[PDB]
């Protein structure tokens, strides 16, 4: 349903840009934190931003490292590019919450806990 937003969850943040979502995780979140938001470069799609690596230097240095993942949203269908595609974003995030998705640079997004919407 259009009134029943699938994004009415704690990990979905309304208006956030690429670095804003990053600032969210790098400053307010922690290792394994993820949040999905509406894409500004790709209007109509969503993005999963995650905090990869630890900030104490047991994975990388220079605080933690945030990667954002593109969630293709066509006809209210969500997919990062892996597994089954869901009509709800909750299933999407939880799917990769158990099955970490990997970048070609080695950065693999370990979705563990959602970044609470600070409002």
């Amino acid at each position: 349903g259009p009134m029943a937003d699938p994004t009415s969850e704690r990990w979905f943040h309304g208006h956030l840009s690429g670095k804003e979502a990053e600032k969210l995780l790098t400053e307010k979140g922690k290792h394994g934190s993820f949040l999905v938001r509406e894409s500004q470069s790709h209007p109509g799609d969503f993005v999963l931003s995650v905090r990869t690596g630890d900030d104490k230097g047991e994975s990388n240095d220079g605080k933690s490292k945030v990667t954002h993942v593109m969630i293709r949203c066509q006809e209210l269908k969500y997919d990062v590019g892996g597994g089954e595609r869901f009509d709800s974003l909750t299933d999407l995030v939880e799917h990769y919450k158990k099955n970490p998705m990997v970048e070609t640079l080695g950065t693999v997004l370990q979705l563990k806990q959602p970044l609470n919407t600070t409002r």
Binding site: E22, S39, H68, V69, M70, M101, V102, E103, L105, T107
Partner: peptide, 11 residues
Amino acid sequence: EQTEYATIVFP
């Protein structure tokens, strides 16, 4: 990586 929206290469 930095924004970029990740490659996500499932091997």
